[PDB]
Symmetry: C3
Subunit: 129 residues, 3 copies
């Protein structure tokens, strides 16, 4: 379970998971691993979420939150997406080739276009704007 | 009473109603009807609210929230304005010629300039920014 | 203690105070006095806060909140910074040459670039965006 600042508050909603995702590659071992997800605005998988592709500007524009409470595509096709929270930067990795418990420079570098603000070692975000 | 997502939270404040508005045309029958209101920034009616005119860019720029808890100009010249909430899109109609309980395409189409974000069938908004 | 709208909520965090500031000039007499602070993004004093300089665009861009609960550099080198609140405009003065309990025209005039919104006599702000 990824830590987050209780004082800041959390807003989360369930979303259907994109079936075409190799969701199993988006765990870490015993340790928590947060990642960003984007929503498909239109098309056949509209309203389904998938791991944000930082190299695709439309994926970046449609980020909807972070997966902070794990996932289990085989047990449930819905995933809890946190749209607003403050999350320590060490827990967010956007890729399989990204060490756990280490801030991801790809995310930190893309924070402006991701609408992330880093304050006191946390990403602050609210994808309801 | 217009439904809204309790989990998201609500922030609301009373505002004086613009006296020059035919407020009676801004009910629906037995059913709830949310609409956007804008504030007059200056002038003699400064700080008074009126139904947003989607065809007037200055009205759009000065939206201050939605009327979600009804109004009664004859019983009280103040109206409770919700500045931040998440409201199902079916309940918001911006005009007399707009069927109740049907999403209003004029609002949906203007959501970007209105600073509305549609997520899971709700308008999310916060006019304190 | 500066008043603020309880209904709106408050989010605050402690920050180290910039040691090079004449912090004693940032009290008012018996009366409360709120002011904006900015964070140093980088450099030797990174993550330390100092009173925003409205005439420096980089200071304006790095505002992080308001000091609403007083300060005491000699008793504690940390100051509680309110990143999100709604504060009556009479209490915020950004300078020694600014009368207490009087809205500061320098702040009001710079509200757009400060990301302050004035609603019903309060500054609304959220520097987590």
């Amino acid at each position: 379970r990824v830590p987050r600042l209780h004082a800041y508050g959390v807003f989360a909603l369930p979303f259907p998971m994109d079936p075409d995702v190799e969701w199993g590659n988006w765990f870490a071992g015993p340790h928590p691993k947060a990642f960003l997800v984007s929503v498909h605005p239109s098309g056949p998988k509209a309203g389904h979420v998938y791991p944000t592709d930082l190299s695709d500007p439309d994926s970046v524009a449609n980020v909807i939150g972070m997966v902070l409470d794990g996932h289990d595509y085989e047990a449930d096709h819905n995933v809890t997406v946190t749209l607003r929270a403050a999350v320590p930067i060490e827990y967010v990795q956007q890729g399989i080739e990204a060490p756990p418990l280490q801030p991801d420079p790809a995310v930190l570098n893309a924070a402006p276009q991701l609408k992330l603000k880093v304050i006191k070692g946390h990403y602050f975000f609210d994808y309801t704007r």
